[PDB]
Amino acid sequence: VLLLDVTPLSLGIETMGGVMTTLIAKNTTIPTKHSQVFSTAEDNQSAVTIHVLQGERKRAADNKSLGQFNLDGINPAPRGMPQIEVTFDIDADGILHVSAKDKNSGKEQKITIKASSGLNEDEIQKMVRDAEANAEADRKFEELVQTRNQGDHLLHSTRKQVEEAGDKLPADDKTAIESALTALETALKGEDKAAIEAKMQELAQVSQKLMEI
């Protein structure tokens, strides 16, 4: 064949830290279908937002929003435990169906997105050019968010361990841990990945007795 229908830009969702995670790559022939299992960002999360995006940028905010829906009724559980199946299905008419199903509860929500939605030909070309021109910056942002997500999880897991230990943790140790947690919390708001990793290292240096507990 000399011609066929494609989806002209990557399609995906916003994930933890404001990144776009792709489900369907740009120039994939249609009809097409792809599913991926996701989970919760924090402990006791009973709802997730499925924010549908079109584009090639690593920052979710830089892509074209196609729509969004919430999936509620998730049984509150530790982060990473729920299995949320997200499915992207584009029919032969270019109509996009996006669904999210929580495997444990069976709860499901879906949205239909019209073929005319999204970016036009000129906006597509500009999206591709802008993604190429900002390739190093988008990769640096992606690396920052991955370090931020680990730091955020370290903040929660350490705070949980401190309350669990209580009296078992000596005063000198708890003091140092709390001081390192504040320094880590501050670094996480910044955009220097090495500064966050360094605060994570400093926290590990004062958490040795908390780890034995």
Partner 1 sequence: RPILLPWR
Measured CA to CA, the distance from residue 202 to residue 197 in angstroms comes to: 9
Which residue, 50 or 169, has its beta carbon nearer to partner 1?
50
At 86, give phi and psi (nearest 5°).
-105, 125
Beta-bridge partners for 108: 101
Identity of the residue numbered 139: R
Can residue 15 be called a binding residue for partner 1 (CB under 8 A)?
Answer: yes
At residue 213, the 3 state secondary structure works out as: coil
- Minimum Å gap between C-beta 144 and partner 1 is 16
* Binding of residue 102 to partner 1 (CB under 8 A): no
Q: Hey, what are 79's tokens?
A: 């982060």
Rounded least distance, CB 201 to partner 1, Å = 23
Residues 97 and 92: their CA atoms lie apart, in Å, by: 12
Q: Does 14 bind partner 1 (CB under 8 A)?
A: yes
Nearer to partner 1, 56 or 152 (CB): 152
What's the closest the beta carbon of residue 94 comes to partner 1, in angstroms? 26
Tell the smallest beta-carbon distance from residue 97 to partner 1 (Å).
19
x-marked contacts with partner 1 along 123-162 as a string, rule CB under 8 A: --------------------------x-------------
Question: 86 to each of 13, 60, 61, 78, how far by Cα in Å?
Answer: 9, 17, 20, 20
Name the one residue in this structure whose structure tokens are 């994939």.
Answer: 28
> Which residues are at the interface with partner 1 (CB under 8 A)?
13-16, 21, 36-42, 45-51, 70, 79-80, 83-84, 149
